[PDB]
Each structure stands twice: as structure tokens, then as C-alpha cells.
Subunit: 327 residues, 3 copies
């Protein structure tokens, strides 16, 4: 596959988070939302990762210091199209440019890879989902099947204002192409701002093809504007991790009362009781039993160990066959 | 708005509660069901709050001693109409009389205020909800839109026995009017008891108008006859409180595993982990972090304090920047 | 009612459990799945309980040593029909033979009793459920209402491949009859194996009647092939136990955060807070209060005792009016 860079849009104010911490730094399973997106970008092979931010520059730079990111400031809040224009000067004409959002944390590498496979030569790869209630969401215009553009809800007509397929806002296309379309955006809009969604029509008019793809899960493209929404995505992710673990052979006594905020390495026949929380990197050897309510953090627990209820195990390497607690 | 008194009906036996404690004293989020209703009545401005009880007089008087209630005994279990008759002698002819139930704890002040606004001069304000399965629930009779009466299920005909709009049983009307209708109730019924729902027709026949209103939430009018029903309402309330907190900026790591049984005052960027229980009046300063499983009761926790997992903090005022526990 | 024996089919490999412990020994609420089935069989009065197993003979014999079971080995994995043939030599011609599965743990005695009542003289009693998505499940063939046979999905035609009523695989019939049909099974099938479901047609052809019955709950007939499925059944069972307790008068502050893995004996007005786990045989006297997160195991707790949060009470008999913990 061709070289590619990634643009991560994190320019919003995050007002409904009612917080002093930049919205995209709020954590999902212990890792900042944007870090989840940055890791997926790196896993894909992004040659560069451009991060476009509104305010909170210092906090962001401070928090993401361990990553090699190209910081792109968006002086004013003029929308995604305007934000992409600020990054455009850094796009190579050889590479594909994938655009993601710092507040859509669960987007999977697997899905982004198919989006990358479906991008036609000279065209665009568009990620979309079938939602019955497009109210608010931008609608996908098609002609005899093929994608023609996107019509922003406020700009959609009653007639088209009931199209079901929705724009996730995630897409990929060649850098030179992107630079071209981005230059041709305009403000004579519902809200005097450049619409990034316009590049879809611009590319259709140039006679280029735009292929639409769908994610395995709707959760992969859910965005976060407030804490009620983050908690909801947190639950979906925990639930997904729990199901994978049970299918993989780890007995969770109640997957709805389990939280993994890190990386779990486990052996065979491990049992985890209710309300357990796993943090950082944790390894549980074969037949380890974790009592209800334990918090295991950055520790390695040997084969056959048993941890009593409500034990906090931190920065510990525990010898095999251990018996931790009274019970 | 006009002066008004409130009648709280708590006359049932509560047999399906299988308890020695009067049903309406059973708690929802730490406060007796009837106390929730009594507080909503006081918040509305009730000049008087009449409490109609079957047995358990002593326990009730003992438990509600800190309230200024007019105790109305209903010697025998002859239904709501009969119960209202026992209170009627205390209604002023100047005031409106609002009738509520001691076992419908979540009725909101906001809703009762609109019910009070929709009551026509000389008429009745009726609270009703759209339920697809009126089986058991009394049906709302209408003619060209306007309310005509209520037909008790056992007294409803197959034809009308499929009306969807249901009678919540909560209503408001002038005291003199109420005294009049109440005097004209009869027993030649399906069960030889006075039907309070009859006053609706009686008032229609007098050529007076009865306006129907709906609550913001169905939970607001759910009644409790057994503990399975109370637990269900407890969960709905907890869930509602959790959502408000998250939207207000408090990070709950799992709103489904959080319980507020009192009043929470909080600052900015507070984090509450799973399985935390808040009781009585609690204040959490800015950036306080509550570890998983803590029980915070009648305490004040200073800015920046961190409470380790499974800590019980009671009747404590904790100094800012505190570090409570091992972790 | 007539004498009857039971055949418990536990011959599968349990590959998707990814465990060294035989699938049917995995626990549901603290008791092995097969033990649940064995207890229901004994409660019904089974004169004998034949256990048919594939591998893991030693572990099974070791684990079920306290039961008087007739061990029937199924040398190769040739399906249920073949498995039943291995047990057939032990069926009496006088008794009814009920067949159950070691991995369908929640089947209730009540339901099995009705299945036993609906079995016609000389016929079969079949347990079936209405499922909209028979994909995979064997379909029930009927003619003018009466059952005619079962058609395995892979052997079902497009036309019949959309019958809704499904075969739970649980059935009962006379031993002599069973011995006869079992002898007439064949391999010229979709997968060269004997189909136990064939006995339905064989019995119809002999002009005998087969009556179908349904369980109170769909959970009663759900089978377990992997740990995600076991956890799901665990939750359903816990939820059912919690509801019975609340309806019976025990206040559970959150039935979704309660686990009973044994037998609870309780008095009046007991209160159990969130995240409590009950194990083995536990008795809670009148008005006992269990704080959040306690683990009560094989203990008796006297009237009026109060147990503070996160207390583990094990193998203890606690004197009445006790105050256990700091709070």
C-alpha cells in the first residue's frame, strides 16, 4: 500500500464537557481519546500525523509530548474545511491523506484499512453508516448507486432531508487532490464557513469516483461532545473487551462489571469475579483467580495465584501459587 | 398563583411489600416515598398537606414528626373516593386541592406546576399518560378532543376497553368544587365503592372543563405496590441523577454503578469511579477524585483531595489536597 | 406417575470453552452445569441417571463422585442419536426415559413435570419453543396441528427452512419404544450420523402421537457452548433469583448487582445493599442489614445484625443484634 499521512481534527472548544482539560485529552479506558486515534494512525503507518487544535495548545503539547506530531494551529473556529486548509500545506502530493477526529476514539484499524483499500485511484474513500434518524447528520447523495456528494442537514431540502446513509466525516484521498479541492471551498453557505463535505461534489464534478465503506460497529464512529456521551462509549468498549475475553477463554463472572484500562495478557482458565478493574499492563498466569472487587495495576501475577476480594495489587510481580489476602 | 393545599393518599395496606414497615415509609434513594411526595408538595407551596392513612398511624406519625401534616384517618379500606371524602371537610373553598399518592415518589415539581397552570377556572387539571396496554389502568373518555370522564377497566366496555390514554390519578381542582362532587359519589359500582374517577364526569355534566396534562417522564407517575417495583423506580432515579451529573460536568466512570442517596454539591472536574455511594449531604471540591467503591456520607471533601478505593468517609470535613488511603 | 429414568447427554468436546475443565463441570451460580441438571433429574424422581460422556471421564467421575450415576462412555463423537444408543441397553421397558443435556443448566423441574404430563400413552412428550430465527435450529413439522417430525436445518428445504417452532432437544418416551426407534436410525444423512430427531417421524409413522410442550422461560432451554453464553445465562439466573427475593420481601438495593451462588434462607425485612455475594448455605435473620460489597459464605446471621460494607463473613454463626465492622 501507498505512503500515507493522517490529519487528526481536535479543533473544537469542548464547551459541553464543562472542564479545564481539553476535551480530546479526556480518557476512555485510561487513555486520552486523541491518543486512541493517534495509536490507530500509527498502527496504520501514517508517515506523519498532523494534529489540528483550537485552544489548549500547551496542555495538549504537554500531554502528547511522547508522540511525534506536527502541530497545526487553527486560529479561529471556522469549521473542519477551514481546519483542513491549515494542514493542507503539509500534505505530500505522493501520499494519501486520511482524516480522523480526536473525539471519535473507537475507530478501528481494521475498518480504516478497508477504507484505504476501497479508495479508487484518483478518488476518495468515504466511511458511512446507515442511521434511521439522519436528523442533524449530513446526508449522502447518490445517483444510480454512486456517491455524488454530501448535503449538510441545514442545507438539505425536505425531500433529501430523509436520506438514511450518514457521513461519518472520515475519509481518505490523495494529497495533491485534497490540496486542489480544499482551495476551491467557499463560504456562501448556511453559515459562512467552508464545508469539508463539499470536496465530495467537487471530486464528483471532476469526474472522479468516490467509494463509500461501512464500519464493523456503529460505536467506531460515535463522536463525543459531552461526558454522558463519553461514558456511553466507555461502556460499549468495556462490553466489547469483556466479550472478547470470555470468547477467548477467560471467565468473567459478570462482563457488565469488569473494566480493562490497559493491556491484559492471560493464560488458561483464569477466573475474574465481579467488579474487578485492570489497569496499565497486567499479566495473569494460568488458573489465576481474581476475587471480587480487586484492582490489579501494572503487575504480573503467577500461575495458580489466588487474590482475595478487594485487594489492590500494584507494581507487583507475584510468585506462582500465591495466596493473597485473608479471603 | 392561587393558594393551594395538597392531599397525599397513603391509605393502602401494602400487603405485597411483606413488611412490618408501612409501605410509604420504604425508602427511595434514602428518603421515604411519602417524604419525597411531601417535599414536592411543600416546594409547590401547599398551604396544608393532608395525609390520609389506613393503618400504621403511630409508625407514620413517629417517622414524619418533623413535618406539619394534618393527619386524616380512613377507618376502612373503601377506596380513593372514600379516602378523599375523609379529607374534604378540611379543604378551603378558596384554595385548589391537588391530590397525590404516597407511593408515586418520583412525581416532579415541574410537572405539578404545569398541571396547576392548565387547570381551567372552575374546572379540573388532569395528569395523564399515553400507555399502549391500558389493561388494568382507567381509560380517559373524550368527545371531540375534550375530556369527558374516566372509565375504570372493570367498568369499561370491550369497545372503550382499548383507549390508550391513561389516568395517572393525579389531579387538581377548587376545594368548594371538590367538596360538591365528592358528596355526589355512589357505590352502585363494580365494587360497591366510591370512584374518585367519577368526579371527572360529574364536572363535565356541570358543564365545566377538564384539561389533561402529561409528565416529562413516565417514571414520574409510576406507583409502587411491591419491592420489585420500588427497585425498578430506584434504578430509574439513579440513572436520571447520574445523567444530570455527567451532563453537568462530573465524570462518573459508570453511571450504572453510582448511587446518590442525598444531596451532592460539587466543583469542577470531579471524578467518581465505579460503585461509589453518596449519602446525606456531601460536598466534593474541585478536582476531587473518588476511587472505586467508596462510600461518602455527610462529609465535605476539599479541593484536589484523592480518596483511595473502598474508603468509607463519614461525618468528615477533609482538608484540601488530601491523600486518603494506601491506594 | 410412572417410574422414569433420565439420560444426561454430556458427550461434546467443549472446544469453544478453551479450557482444561470439562465444559459441563463449568459452574453456573457456584454449581457445575451438569450438577444443576442432575439435581433437577433427582427432584423429578429419576430411578436412574445415565450420564453420557465423551472425554474427561476421570475429571467427571472425580467431580460427580457424590452422585449415583450410571456412566456411559461414547467412544467417538457420532452425535446425540449415537449417544442415546450407548445408553439404550440400560433403559427399562417399564419406565419412561427423559433426555436432557448437561449444558442446558436452567431447565426447570416444573417444566419437566408438564412435559411428563403431556406424554401420550405409547407416545412422546416433546419440549419446543417459538423462536423467530430458526436459522441453525431444527424445525418442527406439523400436519393439521399434530407433530410429524423434526427436520435438521441442513436437511430442511427452503420452504420448510422458515418454520418458527424449534426443537429444544428435550423429550420423554417409554423405554421399550425408545429402544425400538433407536435401533432404526441411519447414517444416509447430511453428515453420516444418526439423527435422534428422527425418532419423531419413526414414531409418527408407527401411528403414535407426539405432543409438544413449551417452557415457562426461554432461558430454561438455552444451551452453553462457550463462556460468553455461560455468562449470559448466569446473569439471567441471577436476575430471576433477585426478582423472586424482592417479590418475597427482601430489599435488594440493586438486583442487577446481587449474586446468589447457593441457598438463601431469610426472615422479614432483610436489606441487602449493592454488590453483595451470597455463597453456599446462608441464613439471614429478621431485619438483618447487609452493607454494600459484603461476601456472606456458609454463615448464619442473627436477627437484627448489621454487617458493615465490604465485610467477608465466612463459616460463621453470628449472634443476634450484632454490629459487624467500623461501618
Amino acid at each position: 500500500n501507498n505512503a500515507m499521512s493522517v490529519v487528526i481534527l481536535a479543533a473544537g472548544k469542548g464547551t459541553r464537557m464543562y472542564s479545564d482539560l481539553p476535551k480530546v485529552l479526556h480518557t476512555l479506558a485510561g487513555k486520552a481519546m486523541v491518543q486512541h486515534v493517534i495509536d490507530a494512525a500509527n498502527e496504520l503507518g501514517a508517515a506523519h500525523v498532523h494534529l489540528v487544535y483550537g485552544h489548549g495548545g500547551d496542555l495538549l503539547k504537554q500531554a502528547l509530548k511522547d508522540d511525534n506530531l506536527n502541530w497545526v494551529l487553527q486560529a479561529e473556529q471556522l469549521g473542519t474545511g477551514h481546519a483542513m486548509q491549515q494542514a493542507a500545506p503539509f500534505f505530500a502530493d505522493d501520499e494519501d491523506i486520511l482524516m480522523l477526529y480526536g473525539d471519535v476514539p473507537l475507530i478501528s484499524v481494521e475498518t480504516l484499512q478497508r477504507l484505504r483499500d476501497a479508495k479508487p485511484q484518483g478518488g476518495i474513500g468515504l466511511l458511512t453508516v446507515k442511521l434511521d434518524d439522519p436528523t442533524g447528520y449530513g446526508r449522502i447523495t447518490r445517483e444510480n448507486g454512486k456517491v455524488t456528494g454530501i448535503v449538510e442537514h441545514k442545507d438539505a431540502t425536505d425531500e433529501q432531508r430523509q436520506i438514511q446513509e450518514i457521513n461519518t466525516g472520515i475519509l481518505i484521498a490523495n494529497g495533491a487532490d485534497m490540496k486542489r479541492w480544499l482551495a476551491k471551498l467557499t463560504n456562501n453557505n448556511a453559515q459562512g464557513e467552508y464545508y469539508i463535505t463539499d470536496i465530495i461534489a467537487l471530486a464528483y464534478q471532476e469526474g472522479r469516483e468516490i467509494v463509500a465503506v461501512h464500519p464493523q460497529r456503529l460505536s467506531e464512529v460515535e463522536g463525543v461532545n459531552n461526558r454522558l456521551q463519553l461514558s456511553r462509549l466507555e461502556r460499549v468498549y468495556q462490553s466489547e473487551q469483556a466479550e472478547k475475553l470470555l470468547l477467548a477463554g477467560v471467565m468473567l463472572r459478570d462482563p457488565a462489571r469488569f473494566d480493562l484500562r490497559g493491556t491484559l495478557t492471560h493464560g488458561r482458565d483464569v477466573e475474574i469475579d465481579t467488579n474487578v478493574i485492570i489497569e496499565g499492563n497486567v499479566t495473569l498466569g494460568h488458573r489465576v483467580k481474581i476475587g471480587t472487587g480487586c484492582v490489579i495495576k501494572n503487575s504480573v501475577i503467577g500461575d495458580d495465584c489466588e487474590i482475595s476480594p478487594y485487594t489492590v495489587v500494584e507494581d507487583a510481580n507475584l510468585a506462582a501459587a500465591c495466596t493473597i489476602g485473608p479471603f
